[PDB]
Design a protein around this ligand. Structure first.
Ligand SMILES: *[C@@H]1O[C@H](CO)[C@@H](O)[C@H](O)[C@H]1NC(C)=O
Ligand SMILES: *[C@@H]1O[C@H](CO)[C@@H](O)[C@H](O)[C@H]1NC(C)=O
Ligand SMILES: *[C@@H]1O[C@H](CO)[C@@H](O)[C@H](O)[C@H]1NC(C)=O
Ligand SMILES: *[C@@H]1O[C@H](CO)[C@@H](O)[C@H](O)[C@H]1NC(C)=O
Ligand SMILES: *[C@@H]1O[C@H](CO)[C@@H](O)[C@H](O)[C@H]1NC(C)=O
Ligand SMILES: *[C@@H]1O[C@H](CO)[C@@H](O)[C@H](O)[C@H]1NC(C)=O
Ligand SMILES: *[C@@H]1O[C@H](CO)[C@@H](O)[C@H](O)[C@H]1NC(C)=O
Ligand SMILES: *[C@@H]1O[C@H](CO)[C@@H](O)[C@H](O)[C@H]1NC(C)=O
Ligand SMILES: *[C@@H]1O[C@H](CO)[C@@H](O)[C@H](O)[C@H]1NC(C)=O
Lengths: 163, 314, 314, 163, 314, 163
């Protein structure tokens, strides 16, 4: 979500994906490994944070017959202190987890882009905004070979080298 | 070929370490706010005390006649509950309440106190059944003729079981000194208690106090816990509400105070006066005094956890 | 073309998860140490009790004559303050102090106790005004001739307002039994109190104790809180310091104990005995017993938060 | 702050910047977008950590007239426990925030360098220490075109390709 | 040329923010579970009270004759310890225990109470030495002939030192009123105490209680702390266990309760009833009531900190 | 530990290392700077977490003579609350430190790979799985020159450019 200036609202198929425009039409197909990785990581975060502590707390005050004022102010004092502690812990917990979640998604995006880049040794060149300018016309089946990580890294080399 | 991420038109703002109000794709709630306005008691042994007080189940006023030997996993106290029929008060009442909430029920057992030379059938207009009655588990000890005198008596009871027993006696504070001399005779009265860990003094104080149930006198209730193979002794001589049966804890339970209805359809382990908190979230903003297996109470009403990526639309 | 970052000659060492002593460009403090040695009371209703004690404002010794009906947002207790002029002590004094600190002031109201057949103008050399005086809100109840006897009297007062009332009575412990018989007559004395929630006994104990203000006897002060439409009853017969006026809480405030000067120039919500903590930092290392809206106290004296990058000089 | 061996103490203009030496003299001008980004992030951290809790705590002890020894030891015990909790939370909070701050600055530096690299497709080549060796003499106005992200990625290509 | 990382065949599973059970190369433990079943007291002044109770060191029963003036850095209480030889109980006993645990030892000093007109050598069959003895630091005050009467006596002692003194007196509760009249004479008895901060009443209550050491009567022990240049006064007239010597705190120490052996070979600052926790880890899952400089107790039995990288084998 | 499909169990010499196969045999020698960096960082984590708080807590309960039931339930209530707080803090602490440790090791690996890549300007090309295909036969002494960061970036250029 860095230099990628915006997101694809039409990509309702997944989190990340490819959108190509060569000569045989248009293409927009989502990627499964990176999206599934991020989904499994966030799912792990939720499964870890959602938790029911088996610790049972009994009644220490009394709502119908108020206890002594001194011990009652001590109990209220302690409960308020603990409440402050748990409010702080909840605030910092949620904030930190959100930060690491956003940076995690950006990291997975960067891993996708770096993988697709390393898959194209010298057959294509970089442009500026998360795209790959091809110097040999790659048909739709070749684009599919790029998606499923089967595009050869030499069988189209010298054709695009001289370009 | 280009490659990018997804986005949505309407995102969800959250808070991070860096910014406050980052619009992300998807988010969830971590602070529970929804409440079930009922006492979810599915699968639990529930005893709704109602008009009977928790301490009364040891003494036995009329309203507790159906709670003398109860057994529960979840004990519920009601605001209309009363611990006494004759006006009086318990000493260290909240400690005994906290003992009885996790007791899992009580089991009475006769102590076997035989009296020779006194009367033992006192009653009052407040504790009413068929006519003028008294506490079910207690015996109002008086003298034999109207007025007369009370002989220096001494009783004793040994706990012959493996669990600590609950012993509760009473001290009658008369409306006036002349009436105390009418019930127990003239002279000083002393109700001595005794055990390996406890023992004390307990002198009565006759005085015309106020009106609550309609009367003026009082009866103060005191209690101790006898260890196994330990003995209790009562060297008394007047103004004594003798115990007839002792109490034994059944096991383990939980006690709550609420004013909502009992519902055996839903299941919950976190309770409060307003109902049951059924949630898997780690935090809740409903009641700070919730008891049971509850999420930790916080002051914030909402804390959104990010489940999606950064939402950057066109 | 090259590209890099900036640096400084003299950096600032901080601590991280990895290392301890990382020199960064810039850093700030998170643990407050600076203190204002004054009580910042700008914009608040402040009542400096001075030589008057907080509890005395209910009884009314001479030093509290100007504090019988105060109204404050910030109440300050001084070490030179005294709750009593005649030697005595309050029962559950700290609870009543914690009640009066957040009361927002007190509002007295006459209880209307008329006496027929006794004397009601006791005084002492300690509580001094023009001559020998007594507590302003209390009435030392005695007998009519020197010696004689005290009739069994019974008074009562009903709270006719929407807020709970503060009722305070006294028990005179004489220097000797003969002097107690001189003031109230021979025989046993009992000062019975009564209400829907309270009521008790309170027998006096005449005995030559020590010397504090210069005398030997004492007066113990007891208190209760009457609920709305609830009634209190006093069935007494000697050694009674009757209440003349009851107290009502005005609203909400805060009570502190300090020995520094009051300053209406600075504003602060966190106070301690040494002054006011004016800070926006989340932590402070000044006083762990600070009250108000304070940063959380920690043991560390300094915790530097990094505001710059890693400082790598040539 | 990784392989960049040291920082520029003379760069009092900002956090990050460019320093070039072609043929028309020397150049040292700071970058505004990355520096402003890091400044806004750290500023957000400070604005979030600096906070006045509206929770008011009343007096539970007494400094002039000490309360009962038992309840006083209970109060002191609780206050010491809470003090330990808040000291731990402060230590871990400051340490974590410092770590994420340093790594944040290094991350922004890497984003700057990667952006300037991707802006130069094949007109310049890498050397080793965060510099870009140019194979066509780029004047000062061309360097300014590199700074404001306006340097063309093809109008100087084949001139530097044969070099 | 290729480049990669290392791995192992058998890794170590840990938990992270993302997953639960990540196999990493190496890991360490953060929650201490190992315990030394001894009291590591190397380099410390240790006083094992044994059969002597901590409070007894102030009164001085036979079993505490060798603990009247001890000095320690680490005080150990044993289950077989007893505070009394004659049957009785301390008032606010746990507060005094918590005072004496961190006292660093006690230093007795004669108070200098001379009596003219009474007997002062009471004893009993329980507190046994050569024959029938009594508390070492106390004096059982009785009357001069068998029966007779007790004169209204008044003593006083001023703390002439810089540290607060520990004053402990006793109240004898006889087996019967006739025996109390046999020891101290007929009539009411009052044991008045007095000081600048304390003072009280303390009337005895003769009554045949139970049997513990084999007797029926009791002696209740009460205590106060005299400030420097402050004076205490005792206006008594019967049923008085007068103090012979006062106590002064030596310095600072720590008190523990354990049932394991003392070991001067190992060193530790964290103790519990089962032994000593010697660890550098920040957490421990042994005893939540551990005292000293301990790691923070947690409920988890193991929390593995990752010290290696992600373990990815072939 | 990303696209590097597995680890070298035989590399008992360090954390990271090089394994080459040219024409003069096989090579497997560990790297010292990155491994030592990660070891120093993890060592710093352990030295910071291992800590003995100088805070001494005294006895507040009593094991041989149980205190009053009310104040005892208050003490037990407070101790259980504090126990919950410290259990939460320990859980989150260990989890976060493990996450940052794994991501730290992966980061150091990426720094090693990026450094070795930037050391080879155009003499070698990328393949796909963390390797560097050489287009000029680099002997064992040249591989050692790559390891100790002494491989020249131009004295083998045009030899591998035409390949
Ligand atoms: C404790 O707080 C509750 C409200 O949360 C209040 O109703 C109660 O009176 C307080 N207890 C005391 C002793 O003030
Ligand atoms: C968004 O998160 C909520 C969390 O409760 C989940 O139920 C929902 O399925 C999620 N939707 C998407 C599109 O991720
Ligand atoms: C209690 O006393 C009985 C009487 O014989 C004995 O059998 C039993 O073992 C005793 N139990 C304990 C726990 O002392
Ligand atoms: C450094 O941080 C302090 C924090 O108080 C701030 O006042 C100051 O302006 C900062 N200076 C620079 C150069 O960042
Ligand atoms: C109190 O009593 C008065 C007397 O009539 C009545 O008007 C008022 O409603 C009562 N208030 C409450 C709260 O019971
Ligand atoms: C609590 O600690 C303070 C010092 O912080 C001390 O002055 C006070 O005496 C302690 N309270 C008790 C009951 O020991
Ligand atoms: C693994 O960690 C433990 C932690 O106690 C350490 O003692 C051991 O030397 C470590 N071994 C390796 C190979 O890192
Ligand atoms: C205590 O009294 C003595 C008697 O002269 C005096 O010298 C000393 O200064 C006094 N100390 C204090 C602390 O009042
Ligand atoms: C506190 O908990 C302990 C066990 O941890 C238990 O033995 C003790 O009885 C409890 N205290 C009270 C007052 O219930």
């Amino acid at each position: 979500a860095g230099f990628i200036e915006n997101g694809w609202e039409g990509l309702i198929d997944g989190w990340y994906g490819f959108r190509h425009q060569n000569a045989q039409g248009e293409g927009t197909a989502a990627d499964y490994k990176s999206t599934q990785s991020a989904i499994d990581q966030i799912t792990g975060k939720l499964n870890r944070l959602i938790e029911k502590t088996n610790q049972q707390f009994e009644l220490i005050d009394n709502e119908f017959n108020e206890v002594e004022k001194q011990i009652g102010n001590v109990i209220n004092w302690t409960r308020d202190s603990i409440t402050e502690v748990w409010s702080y812990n909840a605030e910092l917990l949620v904030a930190m987890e959100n930060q690491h979640t956003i940076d995690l998604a950006d990291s997975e995006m960067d891993k996708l882009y770096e993988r697709v880049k390393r898959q194209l040794r010298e057959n294509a060149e970089e442009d500026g905004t998360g795209c790959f300018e091809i110097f040999h016309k790659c048909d739709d089946d070749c684009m599919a070979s790029i998606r499923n990580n089967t595009y050869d890294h030499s069988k189209y080399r010298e054709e695009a080298m001289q370009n | 070929i280009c490659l990018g991420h997804h986005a949505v038109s309407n995102g969800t703002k959250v808070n991070t370490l860096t910014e406050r109000g980052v619009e992300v794709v998807n988010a969830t709630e971590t602070v529970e706010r929804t409440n079930i306005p009922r006492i979810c008691s599915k699968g639990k042994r529930t005893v709704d005390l109602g008009q009977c007080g928790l301490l009364g189940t040891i003494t036995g006023p009329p309203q507790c006649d159906q709670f003398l030997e109860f057994s529960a996993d979840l004990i519920i106290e009601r605001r209309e509950g009363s611990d006494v029929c004759y006006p009086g008060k318990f000493v260290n009442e909240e400690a005994l309440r906290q003992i009885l909430r996790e007791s899992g029920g009580i089991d009475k057992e006769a102590m076997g106190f035989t009296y020779s030379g006194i009367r033992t059938n006192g009653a009052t207009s407040s504790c009413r059944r068929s006519g003028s009655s008294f506490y079910a588990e207690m015996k109002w000890l008086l003298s034999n003729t109207d007025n007369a005198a009370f002989p220096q008596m001494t009783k004793s009871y040994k706990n012959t079981r493996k669990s600590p027993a609950l012993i509760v006696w009473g001290i009658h504070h008369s409306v006036s000194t002349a009436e105390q001399t009418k019930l127990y005779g003239s002279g000083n009265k002393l109700v001595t208690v005794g055990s390996s860990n406890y023992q004390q003094s307990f002198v009565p104080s006759p005085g015309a106090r106020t009106q609550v149930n309609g009367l003026s006198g009082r009866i103060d209730f005191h209690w101790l816990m006898l260890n196994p193979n330990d003995t209790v002794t009562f060297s008394f001589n007047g103004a004594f509400i003798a115990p007839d049966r002792a109490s034994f804890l059944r096991g383990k339970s939980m006690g709550i105070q609420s004013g909502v209805q009992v519902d055996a359809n839903c299941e919950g382990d976190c309770y409060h006066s307003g109902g049951t908190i059924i949630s898997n979230l780690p935090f809740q903003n409903i009641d700070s005094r919730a008891v049971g297996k509850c999420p930790r109470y916080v002051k914030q009403r909402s804390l959104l956890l990010a489940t999606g990526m950064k939402n950057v639309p066109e």
